[PDB]
Amino acid sequence: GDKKVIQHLNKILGNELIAINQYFLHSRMWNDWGLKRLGAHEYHESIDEMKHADKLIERILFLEGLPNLQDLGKLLIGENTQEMLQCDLNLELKATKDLREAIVHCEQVHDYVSRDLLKDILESEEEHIDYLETQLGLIQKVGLELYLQSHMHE
Template sequence: MTIFFLKIEYLLKSEFEEPLMKGKQKIIDAFNALLANELAAIDQYFIHSRMYEDMGLTKLYERLNHEMEEETTHADWLIKRILFLEGVPNMTKRRDLLIGQDVKSMMENDLTLELEVVACVKDAIKACEEEQDYQSRAVLEKLLFDTEEDHVYWLEQQIGLIEKIGIQNYLQSQLA
């Protein structure tokens, strides 16, 4: 019976006094740096999508709304992981926005942002490996896949189309 109470006491003590998972500050900082990029991407895609809508480019408007939703999902993953690691998500920090004035410059600016996100994710993955935080790395690997295989790929494809068929033909293809 004494062993039973000692076990209960140990479990209660460890649950309330020592957290089971306390993240390394290096990982929390890396996730907050990524969060700043994701929040900026949400804002940048929001502005660009409304500019496309104003231009009557319905397909681009719809695509950027989709991208904005995905960036919101990425930010959600990062916030949840930061909280799990007992950190504080920094919701006020953002990287500078790169707002284009025409379709091609908007896409080029969005690509610049996404490539910066890719570099930041890769740095964060290295930090996770150094700290042996494989669960955080798994979150980042999902984010990296989405960013490289969807966002970057689509933007490079669209910029390539503009160069191949010309801006006027491209714009015509993006109407409703």
């Protein structure tokens, strides 16, 4: 296994671990506030990052690397709905930047299978960006209070 591939994979893994915890707390904060539709959607975002982390961990071990679950970077926790969505978007913008750099290196050393894995993750993070920009746009179009009312009931 290419040593820099493993470093890149461990970097993506670290990003997934931030997102898991950030989205899970954001989910439970929205549930606490009675914004149950946002809570449920954000729960699922968290679960999806868990599954990516699993796939990264499996690949690192196959390549005889050591998965790093010890290092947890900075959680971006907002204190209201609009900040929380922006915090999620900031984290995903960093995530996709790291994914593209990892893919470049995989291509260079011909680790095409690792590249394929990261690209699938990358498509999933861009779908999350799509959702997030759409939510932030809806807040601008209908206003904050109507956006929140629309996410009360599941």
